[PDB]
Amino acid sequence: RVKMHVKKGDTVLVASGKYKGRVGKVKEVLPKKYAVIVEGVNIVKKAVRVSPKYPQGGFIEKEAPLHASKVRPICPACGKPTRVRKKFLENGKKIRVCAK
Amino acid sequence: DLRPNPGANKRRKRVGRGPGSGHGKTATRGHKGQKSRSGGLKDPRRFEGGRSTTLMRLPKRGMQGQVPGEIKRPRYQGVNLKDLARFEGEVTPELLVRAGLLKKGYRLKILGEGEAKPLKVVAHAFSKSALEKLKAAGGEPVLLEA
């Protein structure tokens, strides 16, 4: 509960810092930390790997989660605050003026 | 006129003294110096001679008390007819207390200094002297009875 926010698995712009500007599908949202994942901060883990299984495990420059606040959702007009509007039955989220 | 300088009036200067210092008031306290300068001293007004007090003097106050004590009894408030001149109309217990110089003191007694303005002045008692003062220029009406 309450832990909910800005977006979810979908499409998003990053008004952040390093990746200020970039846009991308949020392949991840973890609310316990308040952090999403797009394709922005993606830094390098020199690490072999933690668990011995699967010998090699990757220097992978994997996708470093973001403060869920540095990303904004987006439509025809890109990057808008979200409004919540009620249909005739449910709750769908209109945007700064558009919808979806 | 703003919060800068509506400041205190060049002299209400709050400034308590501090006795831990090194220069001012120092090893000892504000004063001190010695011993029996610690947590207290016997009184020292009324009390400590160290000896037989200067209540060598002696109760005269005949009628100090009695178990049930104070005896209710009509007390009279002296008001001069010099502070009477202060107005014109019909001066009465109600009035002198209603504003000024009576104050619930069950009984009005006009008396004494000043010159009497010719007028009615009800009260519970007058001065042999003040009865004159005004009786020689106006109405003296006396207290209640029943």
């Binding site: - | 009324r46 003097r57 002696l58």
Partner: protein, 63 residues
């Protein structure tokens, strides 16, 4: 919290409208015997105090 008046003093000392402190003279209640008329006549009246007079007033308070 509110000093209490000192009843012992109340019971034996008046503070005069100017500010003096009056007491009955000591010495007139049984040392008595043969003492001049003067002696015990003189003892009959009130006197005025001094430095303890100030000590005195401190007690008689709401008084």
């Amino acid at each position: 919290p509110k000093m209490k008046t000192h009843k012992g003093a109340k019971k034996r000392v008046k503070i005069t409208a100017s500010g003096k402190v009056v007491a009955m003279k000591t010495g007139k209640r049984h040392l008595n015997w043969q003492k001049s008329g003067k002696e015990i006549r003189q003892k009959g009246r009130k006197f005025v105090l001094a430095k303890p007079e100030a000590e005195r007033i401190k007690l008689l308070l709401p008084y």
